[PDB]
Write an enzyme that holds these catalytic residues in place. Structure first.
Site, PDB file in Angstrom:
ATOM      1  N   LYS D  18      28.157  -9.671   3.194  1.00 47.70           N
ATOM      2  CA  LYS D  18      28.368  -8.207   2.782  1.00 47.70           C
ATOM      3  C   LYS D  18      27.466  -8.127   1.605  1.00 47.70           C
ATOM      4  CE  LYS D  18      31.216  -7.716  -0.491  1.00 47.70           C
ATOM      5  NZ  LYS D  18      32.280  -7.450  -1.410  1.00 47.70           N
ATOM      6  N   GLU D  77      30.283   1.225 -14.425  1.00 43.27           N
ATOM      7  CA  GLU D  77      31.612   0.823 -14.143  1.00 43.27           C
ATOM      8  C   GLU D  77      32.950   1.304 -15.238  1.00 43.27           C
ATOM      9  OE1 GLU D  77      33.008  -1.363 -11.641  1.00 43.27           O
ATOM     10  OE2 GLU D  77      34.959  -0.573 -12.859  1.00 43.27           O
ATOM     11  N   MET D 105      32.047   7.466 -12.998  1.00 42.19           N
ATOM     12  CA  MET D 105      30.761   8.166 -12.339  1.00 42.19           C
ATOM     13  C   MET D 105      30.870   9.574 -12.236  1.00 42.19           C
ATOM     14  SD  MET D 105      31.100   6.606  -8.407  1.00 42.19           S
ATOM     15  CE  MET D 105      31.703   5.050  -8.829  1.00 42.19           C
ATOM     16  N   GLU D 120      30.204   0.083  -3.332  1.00 46.79           N
ATOM     17  CA  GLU D 120      31.246  -0.527  -2.308  1.00 46.79           C
ATOM     18  C   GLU D 120      32.617  -0.052  -2.436  1.00 46.79           C
ATOM     19  OE1 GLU D 120      31.665  -4.626  -2.643  1.00 46.79           O
ATOM     20  OE2 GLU D 120      30.844  -5.050  -4.707  1.00 46.79           O
ATOM     21  N   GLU D 129      40.167   4.361  -0.949  1.00 46.69           N
ATOM     22  CA  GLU D 129      40.033   4.163  -2.158  1.00 46.69           C
ATOM     23  C   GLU D 129      39.125   5.390  -2.948  1.00 46.69           C
ATOM     24  OE1 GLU D 129      37.974   0.265  -3.000  1.00 46.69           O
ATOM     25  OE2 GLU D 129      39.842  -0.711  -2.292  1.00 46.69           O
TER      26      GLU D 129
HETATM   27  C1  LIG Z   1      40.677 -10.304   1.100  1.00 50.31           C
HETATM   28  C2  LIG Z   1      42.181 -10.316   0.694  1.00 50.31           C
HETATM   29  C3  LIG Z   1      42.540 -10.468  -0.676  1.00 50.31           C
HETATM   30  C4  LIG Z   1      41.515  -9.388  -1.446  1.00 50.31           C
HETATM   31  C5  LIG Z   1      41.836  -7.913  -1.051  1.00 50.31           C
HETATM   32  C6  LIG Z   1      43.310  -7.321  -1.598  1.00 50.31           C
HETATM   33  C7  LIG Z   1      44.015  -6.575  -0.871  1.00 50.31           C
HETATM   34  C8  LIG Z   1      45.352  -6.040  -1.668  1.00 50.31           C
HETATM   35  C9  LIG Z   1      45.697  -6.863  -2.698  1.00 50.31           C
HETATM   36  S1  LIG Z   1      47.229  -6.442  -3.584  1.00 50.31           S
HETATM   37  C10 LIG Z   1      46.990  -7.643  -4.601  1.00 50.31           C
HETATM   38  N1  LIG Z   1      45.704  -8.226  -4.128  1.00 50.31           N
HETATM   39  C11 LIG Z   1      45.043  -7.549  -3.296  1.00 50.31           C
HETATM   40  C12 LIG Z   1      43.800  -8.018  -2.780  1.00 50.31           C
HETATM   41  N2  LIG Z   1      41.995  -7.600   0.225  1.00 50.31           N
HETATM   42  C13 LIG Z   1      41.149  -6.522   0.765  1.00 50.31           C
HETATM   43  O1  LIG Z   1      41.196  -6.657   1.941  1.00 50.31           O
HETATM   44  C14 LIG Z   1      40.531  -5.602  -0.036  1.00 50.31           C
HETATM   45  O2  LIG Z   1      41.151  -5.057  -0.642  1.00 50.31           O
HETATM   46  N3  LIG Z   1      39.193  -5.666   0.134  1.00 50.31           N
HETATM   47  C15 LIG Z   1      38.402  -4.725  -0.633  1.00 50.31           C
HETATM   48  C16 LIG Z   1      38.885  -3.721  -1.097  1.00 50.31           C
HETATM   49  N4  LIG Z   1      37.847  -2.723  -1.770  1.00 50.31           N
HETATM   50  C17 LIG Z   1      36.672  -2.878  -2.217  1.00 50.31           C
HETATM   51  N5  LIG Z   1      35.973  -1.991  -3.011  1.00 50.31           N
HETATM   52  C18 LIG Z   1      36.307  -4.221  -1.651  1.00 50.31           C
HETATM   53  C19 LIG Z   1      34.995  -4.669  -1.834  1.00 50.31           C
HETATM   54  N6  LIG Z   1      34.878  -5.975  -1.232  1.00 50.31           N
HETATM   55  N7  LIG Z   1      36.157  -6.202  -0.780  1.00 50.31           N
HETATM   56  C20 LIG Z   1      36.829  -5.105  -0.758  1.00 50.31           C
HETATM   57  C21 LIG Z   1      42.728  -8.616   1.342  1.00 50.31           C
HETATM   58  C1  LIG Z   2      33.723  -3.307  -6.521  1.00 51.29           C
HETATM   59  S1  LIG Z   2      35.426  -2.573  -6.136  1.00 51.29           S
HETATM   60  C2  LIG Z   2      35.029  -0.860  -6.660  1.00 51.29           C
HETATM   61  C3  LIG Z   2      34.469  -1.024  -8.205  1.00 51.29           C
HETATM   62  O1  LIG Z   2      34.282   0.489  -8.684  1.00 51.29           O
HETATM   63  C4  LIG Z   2      34.814   0.961  -9.756  1.00 51.29           C
HETATM   64  N1  LIG Z   2      35.148   2.320  -9.840  1.00 51.29           N
HETATM   65  C5  LIG Z   2      35.954   2.931  -8.769  1.00 51.29           C
HETATM   66  N2  LIG Z   2      35.883   4.262  -9.033  1.00 51.29           N
HETATM   67  C6  LIG Z   2      35.109   4.257 -10.139  1.00 51.29           C
HETATM   68  C7  LIG Z   2      34.515   5.577 -10.576  1.00 51.29           C
HETATM   69  N3  LIG Z   2      34.902   6.890 -10.500  1.00 51.29           N
HETATM   70  N4  LIG Z   2      33.688   5.274 -11.788  1.00 51.29           N
HETATM   71  C8  LIG Z   2      33.283   4.122 -12.010  1.00 51.29           C
HETATM   72  N5  LIG Z   2      33.594   3.062 -11.431  1.00 51.29           N
HETATM   73  C9  LIG Z   2      34.464   3.148 -10.576  1.00 51.29           C
HETATM   74  C10 LIG Z   2      36.343  -0.003  -9.662  1.00 51.29           C
HETATM   75  O2  LIG Z   2      36.811  -0.141 -10.980  1.00 51.29           O
HETATM   76  C11 LIG Z   2      35.663  -1.382  -9.069  1.00 51.29           C
HETATM   77  O3  LIG Z   2      34.868  -2.082 -10.189  1.00 51.29           O
END
Ligand SMILES: C[C@H]1CC[C@H](c2ccc3scnc3c2)N(C(=O)C(=O)Nc2cnc(N)c3cn[nH]c23)C1
Ligand SMILES: CSC[C@H]1O[C@@H](n2cnc3c(N)ncnc32)[C@H](O)[C@@H]1O
Ligand SMILES: C[C@H]1CC[C@H](c2ccc3scnc3c2)N(C(=O)C(=O)Nc2cnc(N)c3cn[nH]c23)C1
Ligand SMILES: C[C@H]1CC[C@H](c2ccc3scnc3c2)N(C(=O)C(=O)Nc2cnc(N)c3cn[nH]c23)C1
Ligand SMILES: CSC[C@H]1O[C@@H](n2cnc3c(N)ncnc32)[C@H](O)[C@@H]1O
Ligand SMILES: CSC[C@H]1O[C@@H](n2cnc3c(N)ncnc32)[C@H](O)[C@@H]1O
Ligand SMILES: [Cl-]
Ligand SMILES: [Cl-]
Ligand SMILES: [Cl-]
Lengths: 303, 625, 625, 322
Positions: D18, D77, D105, D120, D129
């Site tokens: 990634k 952040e 942000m 991301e 998200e």
């Molecule tokens: C890999 C597995 C474990 C971590 C995480 C997960 C999910 C639900 C719960 S509930 C308590 N812990 C967890 C952990 N998993 C995800 O698929 C996930 O959320 N990925 C991501 C989401 N959002 C992002 N911004 C990013 C960036 N990179 N990857 C991201 C499944």
């Molecule tokens: C790397 S996973 C997404 C990241 O962005 C941050 N994030 C999500 N929304 C916001 C926002 N509105 N402003 C700043 N950081 C954010 C989260 O706290 C997390 O660290």
């Protein structure tokens, strides 16, 4: 006196302006008819040639000769009013409640003695304006009749369009008088119709998406189309010119003037509300009067 | 007395219009809360900033008038399911606006049309509005009995109307409703306003709406015929439909203008009142039974519970049942004692479950009607009713009747009985444990003794009733299984329902049960042929009983004892409605299970699709022994 | 019109007695269902087999009469808490028998005595009977205001009556009740029948019963004095007590024989009616407020929710409040514009939260009462009320009033305001988030601009009300925390309650809040001196507000604005009642918490014992921003 | 809405594919925006929006010195716990080249506008998200020709059959809430024992920057899935694709899944009642992306071959906090 929502504007062949307005908000939901021999003084009530109050709102208007005014009412009524011998009064000649819902559109046939009305009761009615009766009642559509338009020179032919996505060419000389035409694919709902003043078998229609289309009846093919407006096309009025212009009205609060190939020649944003009706001056064929729900009467000069 | 309203799409002044429709005799008025042609913009300038007011004021009527007399109508230009995204979002905003203004006014009902197949976004907006602040206001979905497309004149030369039979297509509008209410998750605040056209469809299309929450019926003035004097009337089929709707206590809405312009408008309404005052009259006791229509009650358990005084009073207010019991006892006495022994032979009669003693008086009347001698034992375990029995015995009966305050399964009888007489039967025959009670009482019956009733049989019939299904669903209680209400039967005067197949026998019990190993458990499989498109929500249960020979009682509709009303039918619901297409067979399985302490029923559908086994191990419903 | 009943321990014939007591004017009759001396045996032969009937028949009265006119009485020989085991078990059986016969009759109430300290087994039997079949019948515990031991004549030579003050001992009977209802787990079907003797106790013993579910008051004929004409009357202290009980809408029970034998019996009852027709009359609007007595409602949130039309109608039906607002605006206009500038200076007034515009009309009346020019902005975010505002503006106000359909925290004002006027106050002053709203509106107020109200302060007071505690407890809903109902405030016309200490200020907010860092969160600790033995169930909340200078509004009882009724008090309950002895201090902690989206209150008692922190993180109750 | 834990960020960072893709996207964008002659004069402003513990910051640095271009970095952040890690990184390694911002942000007043914003903020369902709302609030400090990485993302739905997963969802009943709320909320899950009933189709698409007069992130989508097997519908699997820059993409959509990337499991939208689907029938699903000022949520319903209830109406069972 006059209500806010101006609905209809029609020039009599002598230059006078017929206005039809309704109050679509407030305590009283009524309507009014007005005649301005000075079209520039409109919509000021005190400087009008004539004016009268109707019981309900005016959804559509049209002349019947030079003295007649045909009204589609919210009450489900088709009304015929007429002017005084001196044209200082507007008196009700008849008021017939034959529709079960709002009469949305009216169009006088070529003879001038018969008319056709469409309504939200899905029905279309052919009226004899002298006997004050309904000659025919057709339930051909499956939804609200959006527009009816009599052919300019054939007393038995007209057009209808409804929210059932049907454009119907009507010839009352046939056992089954309606014929479905238009796009063979489910295009957006037709909202406005206008026969071509010179080409008999040609008409334009505007849809709910803002598209104006030029169609030939014999070929029943969308000869051309253009995204003229960003909202529903509520009106289409051709000019009296030998090669006529096409005025298009929309709920985007804009007026457009197009040519023979539906190319934009003029555009006006003067209105601040829905543009409701447009009529070309029979005295100055480059002068076009539009009325809308901002209670504004605009006289555009068209290049 | 019909409750009726006037539908109008044109209201110049609300007070004048309301006064006029009240003078015409209407109870309420269906009207728009915004002008029907006042199309509003919510996104695009400049029309987005149209100066107010956007509609008329709430001060024009009293809050009482808003709450009782006004039914709001959705503006006809609001199309939340338009193919155009602009129109879609704008209609979402406008529908929210109009629904919120209706809630602000406190309107008791609001009309919304179902005039096409796809109303998914309309359902989404309405469901979001329903879950925004708890309210009790209703939403009447205006659904046509026949879609306008299938109702248009055959006058389009190049688009002819199909003359071919379309059995399921002719029901399409019902599906329009069925999907909508399914999308809205069977909200109790959503009901049907069935609009009736000039041409009625086939009978199955009409029966498709049986069991549906029809709160209103819309009658256009155009469907009314004209008589000699010029008064508006209806065709005989329309009169059939009006009678059917009157049996559902629906409100009738008159829409359209006056096409019988010679007469007053109230003429229309008057005809309905005419039709209401000349409807086939009901039973004299059917008024107390009318208040019980579709009213869910838990089945009485006279064995586990001691019945209240007024419950016995209701049991006794039924002369047909006790006339039948008296005739049965009379025939049995004449059959057991010849004429020459009429003064020597004293028959021992034992009322097992005497209550306050209507069967005792029936036995006495039968004995002195048959000219035979009897000795009576009135056995009753309910000591509160034993008070009534013993006051009766001291004041009237005398030593001829011996009152026993004991359970018939425990009582050591001083002598054996010629005839035992009981009414331990519930709506499902054996659901009050009459088999077990009469088994425990069998040992003090003579070797040739007679039991009245001698036999009883339960009957089941699949039914369709989304109304009753929603009523069962609303019976969720805290501190128990969220679906326990579906795993228990309900005694209910079934009213707004559709019987899907002829009732068939379920469980049968005979008395005396002279059999080595008595087993009252049962397993039954029933195949119900269904010849309609419908939705199964449960099974109606009835019973027949042979008291003696040709003397019988029955709440089975085909053989219902005329004028007897001490038993309402029973209803076994199911958790999930089951779609049943025309020609399919509903296969149901019913168990009668038991242990030492309790008896219960389990049931399951196995065709056209399987349901869960309902009430397993009696977890949700038991009958105490 | 008093609702009254006759208490009798001797009923020869029930119909004759009922007719007599009805002719005397009584609404019901308290009578035994078994003969009071008919002691029954349930264990030991031969008396165990006493031939019936055990009591009279239920056929002697109609079910209507049993349901409405008869109150059953427990036989006086039934002692479930006897020191003798035989009597204990036999009285258990007999009490079950009599309670089950009362339920069989459908009696609306049943009288049981609390004539000693220990009624544990009585409570056990009654609680078992309550959980045997769901019923709505009431159980009136006959509790004497003074125990007979503390009421006897001082005529026992070797056992003198104590002349020494016993503060808690004189309240002993209340404890008798308090333990009993605690053993029965605060069953809503158990209420108090307070019996009143000839000698009234101290005032604290009487106030001990404030907030208790008193459904009946028993008046013996022996406590009535005699006047000149020989009519029975009561002492002035007894009249005080009768007025207090009439304010609770209790039913009065007349017991004992006629000792004023010259007059009719109804004389007694007539006196009460006399006392009822000459009671201090209430407020004219206190009739609509009477129907709201102790009625729990969720607090309105006019910010998060759009108020309905009739809610605004209730807001406007209060001329005193708007008279005060008009006077405040009038004084402010006279203070801001001198006489010489009265025609040059146009004041900018902004109604923030105009609703349907009563404050707009108040501002207009104040302006032309003060002879000053004003320019009005009517700001309202509720578009439904904006409809009313704009119809008002087109029809009456004109261009003088500019209607704004916007949130006051978002609206970009075209000019700054001289005066901002609002009524964004709830029962707890700031519980409708008036601080946040007026903070968001502060930027378009002039540097010397005035806010009306200029200040507001909430007030708290510990209260005792087992009735309101049980009403809160009954508000349990499925699909949420079983105790969430205790962690949320309720707007309620507090009626049957006991204020335990003087109200003290809680949270105060000023406007305009010219401060660098505005923080509307609050933490407050309050010490309430309590000089009575009591049970804390919650805290009443009121508010005062300074609109302008000496123009104020108040629902604080000591300073309540006379004739103003658009605000009921608020109630913050607690999960567990807290015993408070005389002289102790109730220490309460109250928080006003918030984040970006919501504001809420948290509260906890810390003395004489600690409670749980209620509504932590707003889990049970939030106020939307 | 929540501040992620340290080990959650650790899982996010344990994915070299990634961040290799992110670095390649930043590298291509830097080469496209700064010509060779300006490589020493032009300092690009890069802003990592949602920096976490700063893997995108290191990716930006590696891309900058791989592209031979100068950059100025802002690491934005809102999670202050991760801001601790960011600022320790900045003091110990990064230096003044990286400016750490502890702010949302959507609130942060930037001292200058950005050439490239990098984030991301994507979930298993792309926008679940609230990356659209966050990047909208951050759009005003992006230059008129600024680039957002990702530039686009699209969610995908596919009807699935899994009685096992259906029973697992059914077992997630909790007290003090709706007995069926577990069916009206999505679950991130490594789907294993299931049957995909039709090819995944795109659901919702978002582009950044969203240069549009009236931005509306609400969505309504209707999908027709041809099913050629007899089966039982229990829910819909959800995946996403994203264009970071040009041909540099990430994807958990099975047909186009980025090889060796595993920081995203698929999502699962269940339904209350299983729906029998015969061979040849079409599963019609409707999906809404709804929102108000405080929360965003999804609503969904099946409309063919039979209608389901509208799931999660008004976000009663599941919301995403703004
Ligand atoms: C890999 C597995 C474990 C971590 C995480 C997960 C999910 C639900 C719960 S509930 C308590 N812990 C967890 C952990 N998993 C995800 O698929 C996930 O959320 N990925 C991501 C989401 N959002 C992002 N911004 C990013 C960036 N990179 N990857 C991201 C499944
Ligand atoms: C790397 S996973 C997404 C990241 O962005 C941050 N994030 C999500 N929304 C916001 C926002 N509105 N402003 C700043 N950081 C954010 C989260 O706290 C997390 O660290
Ligand atoms: C008529 C209606 C009102 C009384 C009763 C009923 C039902 C449920 C509840 S729940 C609280 N009250 C009730 C009352 N209804 C019954 O159908 C019924 O139970 N009938 C009978 C049952 N068992 C018997 N042995 C006999 C003998 N004669 N009739 C019997 C409905
Ligand atoms: C009088 C009684 C009936 C109306 C209202 C009430 C309470 C709860 C519910 S729950 C459903 N309806 C209601 C209605 N009551 C209030 O005390 C009240 O809320 N007052 C006010 C609150 N906020 C304001 N800004 C004003 C201005 N004037 N009065 C205000 C009790
Ligand atoms: C008339 S309704 C049935 C009657 O029979 C009584 N009953 C039911 N089961 C028994 C039993 N096992 N022994 C005696 N009476 C019974 C009930 O208490 C009720 O009065
Ligand atoms: C008269 S009760 C309080 C009134 O103020 C209105 N109101 C409450 N908060 C606001 C706000 N922030 N902006 C505008 N009006 C408000 C409410 O909608 C109600 O009409
Ligand atoms: Cl005039
Ligand atoms: Cl029930
Ligand atoms: Cl409540």
């Amino acid at each position: 006196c006059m209500e806010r929502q101006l609905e209809a504007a029609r020039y009599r062949s002598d230059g006078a302006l017929l206005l039809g307005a309704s109050s679509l908000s407030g305590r009283c939901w009524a309507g009014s008819l007005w005649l301005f021999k000075d079209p520039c003084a409109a919509p000021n009530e005190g400087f009008c040639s004539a004016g009268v109050q109707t019981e309900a709102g005016v959804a559509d208007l049209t002349w019947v000769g030079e003295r007649g005014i045909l009204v589609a009412s919210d009450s489900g009524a088709v009304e015929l009013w007429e002017l005084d011998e001196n044209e200082t009064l507007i008196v009700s000649k008849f008021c017939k409640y034959e529709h079960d819902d709002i009469v949305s559109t009216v169009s006088v046939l070529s003879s001038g003695t018969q008319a056709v009305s469409g309504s939200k009761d899905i029905c279309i009615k052919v009226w004899d304006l002298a006997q004050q009766v309904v000659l025919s009642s057709y339930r051909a559509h499956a939804a609200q009749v959006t527009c009816v338009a009599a052919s300019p020179h054939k007393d038995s032919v007209f057009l209808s369009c409804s929210e059932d996505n049907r454009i119907l060419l009507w010839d009352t000389r046939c056992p089954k008088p309606a014929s479905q035409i238009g796009c063979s694919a489910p295009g957006y709902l037709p909202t406005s119709l206008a026969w071509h003043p010179q080409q008999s078998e040609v008409f334009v229609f505007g849809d709910e998406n803002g598209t104006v289309s030029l169609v030939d009846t014999k070929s029943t093919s969308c000869v051309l189309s253009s995204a003229v407006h960003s909202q529903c096309v509520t009106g289409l009025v051709f000019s009296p010119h030998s090669v006529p212009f096409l005025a298009s009205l929309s709920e985007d609060c804009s007026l457009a003037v197009l040519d023979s190939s539906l190319s934009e020649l003029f555009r006006s944003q003067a209105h601040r509300d829905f543009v409701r009706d447009a009529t070309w001056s029979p005295l100055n064929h480059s002068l076009l009067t539009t009325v809308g729900w901002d209670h504004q009467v605009v006289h555009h000069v068209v290049p | 007395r019909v409750s009726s309203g006037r539908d109008l799409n044109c209201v110049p002044e609300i007070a004048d219009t309301l006064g006029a429709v009240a003078k015409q005799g209407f109870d309420f008025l269906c009207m728009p809360v915004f002008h029907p042609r006042f199309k509003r913009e919510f996104i695009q300038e400049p029309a987005k900033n149209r100066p107010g007011p956007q509609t008329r004021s709430d001060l024009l009527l009293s809050g009482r008038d808003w709450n009782t007399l006004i039914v709001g109508k959705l503006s006809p230009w609001i199309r939340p399911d338009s193919k155009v995204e602009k129109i879609r979002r704008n209609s979402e905003a406008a529908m929210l606006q109009e629904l919120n203004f209706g809630a602000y006014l406190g309107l008791p009902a609001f009309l919304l049309p179902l005039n096409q197949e796809d109303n998914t976004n309309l359902a989404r907006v309405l469901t979001n509005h329903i879950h925004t602040g708890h309210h009790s206001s209703m939403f009447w979905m205006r659904v046509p009995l026949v879609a306008p497309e299938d109702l248009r004149d055959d006058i389009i030369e190049n688009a002819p109307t199909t003359h071919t039979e379309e059995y399921s297509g002719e029901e399409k509008t019902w599906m329009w409703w069925h999907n909508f209410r399914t999308l809205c998750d069977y909200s109790k605040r959503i009901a049907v306003a069935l609009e009736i056209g000039a041409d009625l469809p086939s009978n199955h299309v009409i029966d498709r709406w049986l069991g549906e929450p029809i709160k209103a019926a819309i009658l256009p003035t155009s469907i009314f015929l004209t008589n000699k004097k010029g008064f508006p009337v209806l065709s005989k089929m329309h009169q059939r439909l009006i009678f059917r709707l009157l049996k559902l206590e629906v409100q009738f809405i008159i829409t359209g203008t006056n096409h019988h312009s010679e007469k007053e408008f109230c003429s229309y309404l008057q005809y309905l009142e005419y039709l209401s005052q000349n409807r086939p009259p009901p039973n004299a006791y059917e008024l107390f039974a009318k208040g019980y229509e579709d009213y869910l009650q838990s089945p009485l358990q006279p064995l586990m519970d001691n019945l209240e005084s007024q419950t016995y009073e209701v049991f006794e207010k039924d002369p047909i049942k006790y006339s039948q019991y008296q005739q049965a006892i009379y025939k049995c006495l004449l059959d057991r004692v010849p004429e020459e022994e009429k003064d020597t032979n004293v028959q021992v009669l034992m009322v097992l479950g005497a209550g306050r003693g209507p069967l005792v008086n029936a036995s006495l009347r039968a004995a002195k009607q048959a000219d035979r001698r009897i000795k009576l034992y009135a056995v009753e375990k309910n000591p509160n009713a034993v008070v009534t029995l013993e006051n009766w015995q001291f004041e009237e009966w005398g030593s001829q009747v011996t009152v026993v305050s004991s359970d018939m399964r425990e009582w050591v009888a001083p002598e054996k009985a010629d005839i035992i007489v009981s009414e331990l039967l519930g709506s499902f025959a054996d659901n009050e444990l009459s088999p077990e009670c009469l088994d425990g009482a069998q040992h003090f019956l003579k070797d040739d003794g007679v039991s009245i009733p001698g036999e009883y049989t339960s009957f089941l019939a699949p039914i369709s009733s989304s109304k009753l299904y929603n009523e069962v669903r609303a019976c969720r209680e805290k501190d128990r299984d969220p679906e326990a209400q579906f795993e228990m039967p309900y005694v209910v005067r079934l009213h707004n329902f559709h019987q899907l197949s002829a009732p068939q026998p379920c469980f049968t019990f005979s008395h005396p049960n002279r059999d080595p190993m008595i087993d009252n458990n049962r397993y039954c499989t029933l195949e119900f042929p269904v010849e309609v498109n419908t939705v199964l929500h449960g099974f109606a249960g009835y019973f027949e009983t042979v008291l003696y020979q040709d003397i019988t009682l029955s709440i089975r509709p085909e053989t219902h004892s005329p004028g007897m009303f001490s038993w309402f039918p029973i209803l076994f619901p199911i958790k999930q409605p089951i779609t049943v297409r025309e020609g399919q067979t509903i296969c149901v399985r019913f168990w009668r299970c038991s242990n030492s302490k309790k008896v219960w029923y389990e049931w399951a559908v196995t065709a056209p699709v399987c349901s869960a086994i309902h009430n397993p191990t009696g977890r949700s419903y038991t009958i105490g022994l």
